[PDB]
Ligand binder design. Structure first.
Ligand SMILES: [Mg+2]
Ligand SMILES: [Mg+2]
Ligand SMILES: [Mg+2]
Ligand SMILES: [Mg+2]
Ligand SMILES: [Mg+2]
Ligand SMILES: [Mg+2]
Ligand SMILES: [Mg+2]
Ligand SMILES: [Mg+2]
Ligand SMILES: [Mg+2]
Ligand SMILES: [Mg+2]
Ligand SMILES: [Zn+2]
Lengths: 99, 86, 220, 97, 135
RNA sequence: UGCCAGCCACCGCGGUCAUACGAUUAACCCAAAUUAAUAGAUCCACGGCGUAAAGAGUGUUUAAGAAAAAAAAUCACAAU
């Protein structure tokens, strides 16, 4: 039986380190007419805009590539006890699964 | 219970009092377990444990509440504001 | 009468009566991302004993403690379904709400994933009907509402003495919950796994109630 | 006996602190060009922190070095010296819209 | 009828105290199940005060010597060309390959970090992966 | 009777329907005593000082204290 510290040591998210400038492949699970809701698998879905090139082949279940900056967008404003999560992630589109 | 008419306020208070109930532990069913001193807002309440034979030296509201609980022996001293709700 | 007392008191002497320990595992939760939370500044003060640590500002929830809580929570849910109780699933979150509602439809238990009206659990006879039997247990999949406040029905169930099982994140309030499980309520694999475990718990409880009822019928 | 527990070490991924434009540099009142880059060309006013973008130490040293050059007669007051008009723009203020 | 005060105590304590007093004559089934199977923590209301002064949290940061190696890897070569896949539990990154070969190389008895980094890079190059570095 | 006559320890009542004035009936409490007045006994703070009374315009020192467990003095900028 494996201990949980061993699983944290060998999890891919621990191997990620910094959340800035990381190339992560993700999967689109919901289609809004200009908005792509992409579950890259970490914690939250990110929202991207449909690009002007090859915009027809971004559908449900499509795998894309992302460059992560913040895994969860969250900030403090004055007069707030707790931070303000947006319940999203920040990532931009590079392309879709070049194979 | 608050209402325009006194009887309506009486009925509202009677129906709302059964919703909020406490259980008060009584040592040998007559006195409280230990000496309790507290300050709630601006009211200082100090109640003291007594033996079996000398009963209920308390403010009249405390005597009524202790009679409804079942406490027959207590000492009570209240200081500061003697507001009824507090 | 006495045999009904026997069939009520029979599962209470066995810890593993419904055999739920084989339903889930630490790897099963870890593959569905239960161990992640929000940022470290979002950490509620009551989640420090339930947090294993912080990974680069992100809260990591100890799934040893989550499994230890979840075994008791699933066992309590199985027993309250065995004793023919009313079970209500509440999750005020518009990303899974159809999935909670279909989960409860397949369970045969009831769901409130819409707006909770103010005097619903408290002033039950005016809202629902002249004589209404109150719910016996509530599962909160999300203890927070859309404006990041703690849920009203948690406080109302604490007023009405209704037990609950709540999935609390790193920013939630486990103080009012009698059976909290520290976990992740945002990731869809975690939410679907929690719904699947509650589905199999309810189904196992009702089918085992049916079989022991049939055994009681063939006894006499 | 569990070697998979984390160690109480500091953060290894601390990217170093961002630096000012003149940071680990030396300011002076004799060089008119460096002092006059941080000055409005039309009026001669001194830009603040939100336009200049320095450490507070260097912002104070630039302010004192300019004012010393203003009093001692090395640089103009009412205008930027037009011989150094075409210097590269370090300030973030945009005058033409 | 019941006890509706939230801050007095747990629902278990309130129900057992009211039945002990004698106001409640119908025993709930959840009370018996609670007597069978208790929680880890009793649900008593605690007021979430805000923390002031020199007192801070007890949460420990999750760090490793492997993360110390990952810091130098991300400083020199940046992110790996293999990208990242968080859906596979057994995903082996180029970064984690560098970490493993760094461990296997320091098991040879070399203390010098420059020698460890250079021979780890050439051991990566011998396995066919590409190190673009940062220009 | 009608802010008149008048009453009260305090709040207060009497301005043509007064359980508060004067009388009558009834009732309450003391009792060879009952009220009024004046002295006493008791009663203020081991409580507070931003807004209600209270942190004295500032620093140093004498007297008087506390040193109770562990350390320190010291660096950009507009003191005079
Ligand atoms: Mg959450
Ligand atoms: Mg008058
Ligand atoms: Mg008189
Ligand atoms: Mg008259
Ligand atoms: Mg009188
Ligand atoms: Mg009279
Ligand atoms: Mg006083
Ligand atoms: Mg004053
Ligand atoms: Mg002062
Ligand atoms: Mg004065
Ligand atoms: Zn600088």
């Amino acid at each position: 039986v494996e201990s949980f510290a061993s699983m944290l040591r060998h999890s891919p998210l621990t191997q990620m380190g910094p959340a800035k400038n990381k190339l992560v492949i993700g999967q689109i699970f919901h289609i809004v007419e200009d908005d792509l809701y992409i579950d890259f698998g970490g914690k939250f879905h990110c929202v991207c805009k449909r690009p002007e090139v090859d915009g027809e082949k971004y559908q449900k279940g499509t795998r894309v590539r992302l460059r992560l900056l913040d895994l969860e967008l969250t900030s403090r404003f004055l007069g707030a006890t707790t931070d303000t999560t947006i319940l999203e992630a920040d990532a931009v589109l590079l392309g879709l699964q070049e194979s | 219970g608050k209402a325009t008419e006194r009887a309506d306020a009486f009925r509202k208070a009677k129906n709302r009092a059964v919703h909020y109930l406490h259980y008060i532990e009584r040592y040998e069913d007559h006195t409280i377990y230990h000496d309790i001193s507290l300050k709630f807002k601006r009211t200082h309440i100090k109640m003291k444990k007594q033996p079996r034979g000398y009963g209920l030296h308390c403010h009249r509201a405390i005597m009524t509440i202790c009679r409804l609980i079942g406490i027959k022996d207590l000492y009570a001293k209240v200081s500061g504001s003697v507001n009824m709700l507090n | 009468n006495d045999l009904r007392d026997r069939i009520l008191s029979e599962p209470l002497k066995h810890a593993d009566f419904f055999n739920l320990k084989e339903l889930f595992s630490v790897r099963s939760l870890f593959d569905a991302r239960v161990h992640l939370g929000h940022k470290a500044g979002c950490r509620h003060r009551f989640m420090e004993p339930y947090l294993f640590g912080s990974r680069l500002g992100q809260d990591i929830i100890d799934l040893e403690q989550t499994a230890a809580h979840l075994q008791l929570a699933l066992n309590f849910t199985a027993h309250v379904a065995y004793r023919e109780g009313i079970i209500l699933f509440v999750s005020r979150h518009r990303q899974f709400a159809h999935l909670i509602e279909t989960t409860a439809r397949d369970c045969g238990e009831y769901a409130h994933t819409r707006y909770f009206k103010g005097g619903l659990l408290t002033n039950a006879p005016l809202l629902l009907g002249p004589g209404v039997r109150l719910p016996d247990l509530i599962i909160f999949l999300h203890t927070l509402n859309n404006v990041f406040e703690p849920h009203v029905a948690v406080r109302d169930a604490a007023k009405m003495n209704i037990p609950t099982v709540g999935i609390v994140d790193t920013n939630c309030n486990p103080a009012l919950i009698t059976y909290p499980v520290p976990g992740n309520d945002d990731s869809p694999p975690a939410v679907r796994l929690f719904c699947r475990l509650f589905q199999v718990a309810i189904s196992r409880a009702k089918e085992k109630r049916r079989q022991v009822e049939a055994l009681y019928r063939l006894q006499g | 006996s569990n070697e998979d527990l984390p160690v109480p070490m500091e953060n290894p991924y601390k990217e170093p602190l961002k630096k000012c434009i003149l940071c680990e540099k030396h300011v002076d009142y004799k060089n008119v060009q460096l002092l006059s880059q941080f000055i409005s060309p039309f009026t001669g006013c001194i830009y603040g922190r939100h336009i200049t973008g320095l450490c507070g130490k260097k912002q104070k040293e630039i302010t004192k070095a300019i004012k010393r050059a203003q009093i001692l007669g090395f640089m103009p007051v009412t205008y930027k010296d037009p011989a150094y008009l075409k210097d590269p723009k370090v300030c973030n203020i945009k005058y033409r819209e | 009828a019941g006890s509706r005060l939230e801050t007095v105590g747990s629902i278990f304590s309130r129900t057992r105290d009211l039945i002990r007093a004698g106001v409640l004559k119908e025993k709930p089934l959840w009370l018996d199940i609670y007597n069978a199977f208790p929680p880890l923590r009793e649900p008593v209301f605690r007021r979430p005060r805000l923390r002031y002064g020199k007192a801070k949290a007890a949460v420990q940061d999750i760090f490793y010597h492997e993360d110390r190696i990952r810091a130098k890897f991300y400083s020199a070569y940046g992110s790996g060309p293999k990208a990242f896949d968080l859906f596979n539990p057994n995903f082996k990154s180029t970064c984690q390959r560098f970490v493993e070969k760094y461990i296997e190389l320091q098991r040879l008895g070399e203390t010098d970090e420059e020698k460890l980094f250079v021979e780890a890079g050439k051991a990566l190059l011998a396995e066919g992966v590409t190190l673009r570095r940062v220009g």
